[PDB]
C-alpha cells in the first residue's frame, strides 16, 4: 500500500512471512525502485524457522532489521525526499522452488 513519512524521521517497512511447516535456507531481498533508479537495499538468509536472519548485503547504513515473528521488516532512518519510491520485499525458498513477492509499498516522504 502507501505510506507517508516526514523528512528526517524514520519509518518501519513491514514484511512478515509464515510457513505452514517451516523452512530451510530461506533467502530474502528488499529492493527500491524509482523512475530512474533500482537498488538492492538489504539481503540475507534464514537457516530455519528457529533461526534469526543473517544479513549478507546492506547497501545503506540507515537501514536496520527490526528483529523477531517470521519477520524481516526494516527500519529506514534519517529520511530524505529522495527516499520516496517503491519498496518491495522478496522471499525465496529454493527447496520449495518458491518465490513470493510481497505487495510493493509506496513510501512518500513529505515536508
Amino acid at each position: 500500500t502507501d505510506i507517508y513519512a516526514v523528512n528526517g524521521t524514520e519509518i518501519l517497512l513491514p514484511c512478515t512471512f509464515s510457513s505452514c511447516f517451516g523452512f530451510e535456507d530461506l533467502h530474502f531481498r528488499w529492493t527500491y525502485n524509482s523512475s530512474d533508479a533500482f537498488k538492492i537495499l538489504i539481503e540475507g538468509t534464514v537457516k530455519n524457522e528457529k533461526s534469526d536472519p543473517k544479513v549478507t548485503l546492506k547497501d545503506d547504513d540507515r537501514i536496520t532489521l527490526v528483529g523477531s515473528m517470521n519477520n524481516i521488516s526494516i527500519v529506514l532512518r534519517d529520511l530524505e525526499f529522495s527516499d520516496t519510491g517503491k519498496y518491495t520485499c522478496h522471499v525465496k525458498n529454493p527447496k520449495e522452488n518458491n518465490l513470493q513477492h510481497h505487495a510493493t509499498i509506496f513510501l512518500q516522504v513529505v515536508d
Binding site: C20, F21, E96, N97, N98
Partner: protein, 1138 residues
C-alpha cells in the same frame, strides 16, 4: 400510496422471478476462485438488491410502526442473517486476514426459498431422517464395541516397523525414518512383525515398534478415537483393503478372523438396516401422500404425396429400418485403434450409406403426414434431430477435439424402444429423472453446488498455501479444492464412496476438526439425498429271473443310508486333497505320493458309484436329471485324463491343461446338501429375467464403449524411462517419432500402453466395469484426462474436462441401470414368492421348522416369575434390590465401566495403568456383589430368563480373567495370549442390550436372518474354494507387481483364500488383475527356473485371468445381492408384523 404500493409488488410473480434470477446469477458469480475488481461492485449491486427485497418485506409486514417486522418464517431468519452479515462486514474491519468469507455462500441457500416446490422436499427429507434414531444408536454401539476390541488386540501394532542396524543409545535410533525400510517409493514405512504368519523382513532388519503411524499418522488402533475412525472406514468399505493388509502384515494372518467378523457384521448388517429403515420411511411416506390425495404448389404436392403415402405403412419397411439400425450399431462397433485403410474405407462407406438411406427414408416419409402435421409423435422429432445433426456434421470436417459429433449418430439405437419394451422402461426412468422427480434432483444439484463451494471457500487457500505437506514436487495433487471444478469432483467422489484418501489430504493441510466436520456432513447429507432419489425413482416406476433280481439289490444299495453318506464323505475327502497342492508339494515326498494314490482311488470309486447308479436307475431315469448329468460330466473329464495318462499321451498341449479340470470336483457336494441346492434352484429360477435385463444393460454399455473408443483408444500410450517409472514430459518428448528417436539412440524410454483401455469394444467393456464398480477408475481417468491426441505424448491434465464423460457414465450406466435392475428384481421376486404360495426361500425343509419355533419365541413375555424369599432379612433385601432404581443404577454403572474402558491407550505410564487396573478391579468387585446379592433375593432359581444367565457367565469370565493375570507372571507366558484373554471383560459391555428395548428387536431380526444366510454362506464358501484351487493352479507363479506380494498371493491355500475373501466385496481386484494381464517381455520373463517346481514362466495368460476375475465378480455380485435380499425381506416382515 405508502403501504399500498409495497404490498402489491410483493405478491406478484414478476418480483419473485427477479429475485430468482438474481439468486442464480450470484450463484454463478460465487463460483469463481479470485473474483476480479468489477465483480466487487457486482457484489455491491447484489447486496443492494437483497436490501431492497428485505426492505419491501419489512415495509409489507411492519408498515406504519407495528411493533415488529417479518419474523416467523425460518427462511426469513436466513435472509436476515445473510443481509446482517453483509452490512456488518461492509463496516471497515472484521478481522482483516479474513475467515468469514465462507458465510457468504448462505445467499446461495436462498434458492430453496423461492424455487416453487422445494420447501416440501426438504421438509420431507427431514421426516425420513427422523426414523433413523434407533439404527444410529445401534451402529454407534457396535462401532464402539468393535473399536474397543480392535484397540485391545492391535494396541500399537500398526506402528510396527522394520529397523536396520547402525554402522547408552536408544529412543533416538528408532525414529528419523532413515533406518527404516521403504519398499521402492511407497512413503509409508513397510510394516513387519515378530510372529510367524506375519510380515517378514529382509536381511538385517529387525522388528521394533517405533514411529508415527500408517498414512500420515491418522491410522492406528490406539487412542480409542482413532479406532473409531478406522472401524468407521471399515463400515463403509472405503479403501478397507489397505487396513486389512496393513493389519495382517503386522499382527499376523490369523487375525483375518476379526476382519471377516467386522466386515460381515458392520459393513453388511448396519448398511442393510440403514437402507431398510430409510426405505420403510419412504414407502409409508408415499402411501400417506396417496391416501391424502384419495379423499399449383399445394394441389400437385398432395397429388405427389398420394402415392408415396400409400407405400410406407403396409410392408416390412420400418422393420428394415430396425435391421438397418442394428447393422449400423455393429458397423460403428467394429471400430478400434490400429485399422488398415482397407478397413477404414469399409467403415466410412458403410457410415455414409447408412446416413444416406436414413435421411432418404426421412425425406420420403416426411411427406405422408404433412410437416407440422408430422412433428407430433415425439419419436419423429427425435428421428429428425438425429438425421439433421448427421447431415450437418457430415460436411464440416473441422472440429478439432470436438469430433464428438461422430457419436451423435449413436443415439438412433434408441429407436428400438418402439418394439423393445425394457429399453422403453429404461427411457421412462431416465426421463422421469427430470420429470416428476425434477425438483428432487434439483435439490440434489443445489446441495452438490453448496458443498463444492463451501469446501472451496473453507479449504481452498490452504491447498495452495501448504502444498509441500501433501506432495513430492510441491504441486497440487490430482484431487483438491483450489477451484470449483476439482472441488465438485471431490464431492462427487465422496458421493461415490471414496471419502477417506482425500480426507487425509484435507486434514493434513487444514486442521483435523474442520475437515472431519465438513467431510462427515458431506458424506451423510449427500448420501442421504442420493439414497432418497434412488428410492424415489424406484418406488414410483413399478408402483429276467436274475436280471430283475440284481436291479433290486443294487437299488437297495444306492438308496441305503450308509451309501450316500459314504459317498459324500469321499467327495469331501477328495475335495480336501486338492488344497495340499501348494508350491511346497514337490518338497514333501511323503504326502505327494499318497495324494497321487488317492487321486486314482477316488477316480475308481467315483466310477464305481456312477456304474451302480446306471445299473440301478436305467439310462432314462438317469439322463433326465440335471444333477446326475453334472456328476457324469466330471467323471467323464476324469476318465479322459486317466486314459491319457494310461495309454501314453502323458504330457501334451491339452492333457497338461486337463489336470486343472480337477478343480471342478468340489461341485459334487451341491446335490448332497440341501443348503446349496436350494440356493442354486433359487438362482436358476430367476436367471432368465436377469438375462433379459442384461441385454439392455449390455447395449447401453455398448453405447458408452463406442463413445470411449471414439474419444480414446489411441491416446493412452506413453513413454516412460524404465529406471523409475516416470512420465516423459512434453518438453523432452512430444510424440511417437521423438520416442523412437530416443530408443534408436540407445536410451531407456518405454512406449507403453495402459493395458486397461478403450482400444477395442472388448477392452471398453472391461474399463467400464472397473469404472462402474469404483475399483480401478483412478488410473483409467488419469490416462483419459491427459489424453492429448492419438500417437501424441499425453500431457498432465490437458484434456481436463473429459472427467465429465466418466461422470455422465457413472450417472447413466451405473445409477439408472442399477435402478432398473433392482426394479425388475423386485418384480420377478414378487411373482416368484406369489407362485410358491408359501414363503421364505433360501431355507431347507428342516430349517423352516426351526424358524417357525423362533417366531413364537420372539412374541411373548414373562409374568410374575418371583414368588418371594419367604420371611427373613432376605425379604427386605429382595424389597431393596428388585426395584427399578437398582436396575437403572447397574446400567449407569456399566456405562461408567465402558467409559473407564475407553481410556486405555498404547504407551501409557505405569501410574495410569495401575489406577486403571485398580478401578477395573473395583468394578469387577461391584458387579460380583451385584450378582451374589441377587442370588440371595431370588434364591430358588435365579435362572429363568437368559439375561441373568448371561450376567452369570460374564461375571465368571471376568473372575477367571483376573484370577490368571497373576498366572502370566509365574507360569506359562504369552503376551499375545494375554491380549486375547483380557478381552473377556468386554462381555460386561454387552449387558447394555438388556434395557434398550428396540435394539434387541434388530438383533432378533439378525437371529432370524442367520439360518437363511448360512446356506448362502456355504455356497459362497464353495465357490471361493473352487476359485481358490483355480488360482492356485494357474496364478500361483505370476510376477509380484502392485497387487500381488509376499503376503497376499496365490501360492498356497491360505493366501489364496485371504485374497479371494478380499475380492468377494469386489475390493482391490484391479490390482490383482494388474500382474496377470502381463503377457510377454519386456514385462515378464517367460523362461524362469523359479525354484520348487518344474513349471516355468513368471506370469499368467490374460484371457484366463480376465475370465476368472470377471466371472467371480459377477457370481459374487449375484450371491451377495441375494444375501442383501434375504436380510431385507426379513427386515420388512418384522416391522410390518409389529
Amino acid at each position: 400510496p405508502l403501504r399500498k404500493i409495497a404490498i402489491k409488488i410483493l405478491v406478484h410473480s414478476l418480483f419473485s422471478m427477479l429475485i430468482m434470477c438474481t439468486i442464480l446469477t450470484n450463484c454463478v458469480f460465487m463460483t469463481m476462485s479470485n473474483p476480479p475488481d468489477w465483480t466487487k461492485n457486482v457484489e455491491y449491486t447484489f447486496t443492494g438488491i437483497y436490501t431492497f427485497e428485505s426492505l419491501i418485506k419489512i415495509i409489507a409486514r411492519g408498515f406504519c410502526l407495528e411493533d415488529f417486522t417479518f419474523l416467523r418464517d425460518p427462511w426469513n431468519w436466513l435472509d436476515f442473517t445473510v443481509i446482517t452479515f453483509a452490512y456488518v462486514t461492509e463496516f471497515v474491519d472484521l478481522g482483516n486476514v479474513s475467515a468469514l468469507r465462507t458465510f457468504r455462500v448462505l445467499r446461495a441457500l436462498k434458492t430453496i426459498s423461492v424455487i416453487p416446490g422445494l420447501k416440501t422436499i426438504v421438509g420431507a427429507l427431514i421426516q425420513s431422517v427422523k426414523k433413523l434414531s434407533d439404527v444410529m444408536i445401534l451402529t454407534v454401539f457396535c462401532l464402539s464395541v468393535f473399536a474397543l476390541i480392535g484397540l485391545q488386540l492391535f494396541m500399537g501394532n500398526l506402528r510396527n516397523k522394520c529397523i536396520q542396524w547402525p554402522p547408552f543409545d536408544w529412543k533416538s535410533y528408532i525414529q528419523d525414518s532413515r533406518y527404516h525400510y521403504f519398499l521402492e517409493g511407497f512413503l509409508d514405512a513397510l510394516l513387519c512383525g515378530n510372529s510367524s504368519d506375519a510380515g517378514q523382513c529382509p536381511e538385517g532388519y529387525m522388528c521394533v515398534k517405533a514411529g508415527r503411524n500408517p498414512n500420515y499418522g491418522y491410522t492406528s488402533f490406539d487412542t480409542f478415537s482413532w479406532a473409531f475412525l478406522s472401524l468407521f472406514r471399515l463400515m463403509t468399505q472405503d479403501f478397507w483393503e489397505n487396513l486389512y493388509q496393513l493389519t495382517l502384515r503386522a499382527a499376523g494372518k490369523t487375525y483375518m478372523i476379526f476382519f471377516v467378523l467386522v466386515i460381515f457384521l458392520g459393513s453388511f448388517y448396519l448398511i442393510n438396516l440403514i437402507l431398510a429403515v430409510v426405505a420403510m420411511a419412504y414407502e409409508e411416506q408415499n402411501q400417506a401422500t396417496l391416501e391424502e390425495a384419495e379423499q399449383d404448389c399445394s394441389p400437385y404436392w398432395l397429388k405427389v404425396k398420394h402415392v408415396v403415402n400409400l407405400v410406407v405403412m403396409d410392408p416390412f419397411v420400418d422393420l428394415a429400418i430396425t435391421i438397418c439400425i442394428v447393422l449400423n450399431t455393429l458397423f460403428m462397433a467394429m471400430e478400434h485403434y490400429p485399422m488398415t485403410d482397407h478397413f477404414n474405407n469399409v467403415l466410412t462407406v458403410g457410415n455414409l450409406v447408412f446416413t444416406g438411406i436414413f435421411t432418404a427414408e426421412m425425406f420420403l416419409k416426411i411427406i405422408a403426414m404433412d410437416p407440422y402435421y408430422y412433428f407430433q409423435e415425439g419419436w419423429n422429432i427425435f428421428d429428425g434431430f438425429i438425421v439433421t445433426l448427421s447431415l450437418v456434421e457430415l460436411g464440416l470436417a473441422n472440429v478439432e477435439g470436438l469430433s464428438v459429433l461422430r457419436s451423435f449418430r449413436l443415439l438412433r439405437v434408441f429407436k428400438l424402444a418402439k418394439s423393445w419394451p425394457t429399453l422403453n422402461m429404461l427411457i421412462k426412468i431416465i426421463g422421469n429423472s427430470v420429470g416428476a422427480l425434477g425438483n428432487l434432483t434439483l435439490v440434489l444439484a443445489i446441495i452438490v453446488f453448496i458443498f463444492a463451494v463451501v469446501g472451496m471457500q473453507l479449504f481452498g487457500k490452504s491447498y495452495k498455501d501448504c502444498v509441500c505437506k501433501i506432495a513430492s514436487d510441491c504441486q497440487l495433487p490430482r484431487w483438491h479444492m483450489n477451484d470449483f471444478f476439482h472441488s465438485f469432483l471431490i464431492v462427487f467422489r465422496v458421493l461415490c464412496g471414496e471419502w477417506i484418501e482425500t480426507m487425509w489430504d484435507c486434514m493434513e493441510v487444514a486442521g483435523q476438526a474442520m475437515c472431519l466436520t465438513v467431510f462427515m456432513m458431506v458424506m451423510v447429507i449427500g448420501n442421504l439425498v442420493v439414497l432418497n432419489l434412488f428410492l424415489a425413482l424406484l418406488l414410483s416406476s413399478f408402483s429276467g429271473k436274475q436280471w430283475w433280481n440284481l436291479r433290486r439289490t443294487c437299488f437297495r444299495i444306492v438308496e441305503h443310508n450308509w451309501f450316500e453318506t459314504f459317498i459324500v464323505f469321499m467327495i469331501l475327502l477328495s475335495s480336501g486333497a486338492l488344497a495340499f497342492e501348494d508350491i511346497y508339494i514337490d518338497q514333501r515326498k511323503t504326502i505327494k505320493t499318497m495324494l497321487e494314490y488317492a487321486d486314482k482311488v477316488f477316480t475308481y470309486i467315483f466310477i464305481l458309484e456312477m456304474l451302480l447308479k446306471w445299473v440301478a436307475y436305467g439310462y432314462q431315469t438317469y439322463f433326465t436329471n440335471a444333477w446326475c448329468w453334472l456328476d457324469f460330466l466330471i467323471v467323464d473329464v476324469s476318465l479322459v485324463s486317466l486314459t491319457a495318462n494310461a495309454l501314453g499321451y502323458s504330457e501334451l498341449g491339452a492333457i497338461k491343461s486337463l489336470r486343472t479340470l480337477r478343480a471342478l470336483r468340489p461341485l459334487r457336494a451341491l446335490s448332497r446338501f440341501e443348503g446349496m441346492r436350494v440356493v442354486v434352484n433359487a438362482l436358476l429360477g430367476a436367471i432368465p429375467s436377469i438375462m433379459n435385463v442384461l441385454l439392455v444393460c449390455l447395449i447401453f454399455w455398448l453405447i458408452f464403449s463406442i463413445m470411449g473408443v471414439n474419444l480414446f483408444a489411441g491416446k493412452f500410450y506413453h513413454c516412460i524411462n524404465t529406471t523409475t517409472g516416470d512420465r516423459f514430459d512434453i518438453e523432452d518428448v512430444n510424440n511417437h517419432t521423438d520416442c523412437l528417436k530416443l530408443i534408436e539412440r540407445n536410451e531407456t524410454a518405454r512406449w507403453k500402453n495402459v493395458k486397461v483401455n478403450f482400444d477395442n469394444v472388448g477392452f471398453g467393456y472391461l474399463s467400464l466395469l472397473q469404472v462402474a464398480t469404483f475399483k480401478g477408475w483412478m488410473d483409467i481417468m488419469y490416462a483419459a484426462v491427459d489424453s492429448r491426441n492419438v500417437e501424441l505424448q499425453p500431457k498432465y491434465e490437458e484434456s481436463l474436462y473429459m472427467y465429465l464423460y466418466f461422470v455422465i457414465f457413472i450417472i447413466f450406466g451405473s445409477f439408472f441401470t442399477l435402478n432398473l435392475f433392482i426394479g425388475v428384481i423386485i418384480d420377478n421376486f414378487n411373482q416368484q414368492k406369489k407362485k410358491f404360495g408359501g414363503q421364505d426361500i433360501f431355507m431347507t425343509e428342516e430349517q423352516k421348522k426351526y424358524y417357525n419355533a423362533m417366531k413364537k419365541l420372539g412374541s411373548k413375555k414373562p409374568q410374575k416369575p418371583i414368588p418371594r424369599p419367604g420371611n427373613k432379612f432376605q425379604g427386605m433385601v429382595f424389597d431393596f434390590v428388585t426395584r427399578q432404581v437398582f436396575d437403572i443404577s447397574i446400567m449407569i454403572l456399566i456405562c461408567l465401566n465402558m467409559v473407564t474402558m475407553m481410556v486405555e491407550t498404547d504407551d501409557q505410564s505405569e501410574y495410569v495403568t495401575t489406577i486403571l487396573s485398580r478401578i477395573n478391579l473395583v468394578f469387577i468387585v461391584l458387579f460380583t456383589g451385584e450378582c451374589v446379592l441377587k442370588l440371595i433375593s431370588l434364591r430358588h432359581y435365579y435362572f429363568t430368563i437368559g439375561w441373568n444367565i448371561f450376567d452369570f457367565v460374564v461375571v465368571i469370565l471376568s473372575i477367571v480373567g483376573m484370577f490368571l493375570a497373576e498366572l502370566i507372571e509365574k507360569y506359562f507366558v504369552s503376551p499375545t495370549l494375554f491380549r486375547v484373554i483380557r478381552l473377556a471383560r468386554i462381555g460386561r459391555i454387552l449387558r447394555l442390550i438388556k434395557g434398550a428395548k428396540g435394539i434387541r428387536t434388530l438383533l432378533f431380526a439378525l437371529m432370524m436372518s442367520l439360518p437363511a444366510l448360512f446356506n448362502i454362506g456355504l455356497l459362497l464358501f464353495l465357490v471361493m474354494f473352487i476359485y481358490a484351487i483355480f488360482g492356485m493352479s494357474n496364478f500361483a507363479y505370476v510376477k509380484r507387481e502392485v497387487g500381488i506380494d509376499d503376503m497376499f498371493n496365490f501360492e498356497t491355500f491360505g493366501n489364496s483364500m485371504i485374497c479371494l475373501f478380499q475380492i468377494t466385496t469386489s475390493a482391490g481386484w484391479d490390482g490383482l488383475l494388474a500382474p496377470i494381464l502381463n503377457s510377454k517381455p519386456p514385462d515378464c520373463d517367460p523362461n524362469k527356473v523359479n525354484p520348487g517346481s518344474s513349471v516355468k514362466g513368471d506370469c499368467g495368460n490374460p484371457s484366463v485371468g480376465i475370465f476368472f476375475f470377471v466371472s467371480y465378480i459377477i457370481i459374487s455380485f449375484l450371491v451377495v445381492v441375494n444375501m442383501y435380499i434375504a436380510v431385507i425381506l426379513e427386515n420388512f416382515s418384522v416391522a410390518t408384523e409389529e
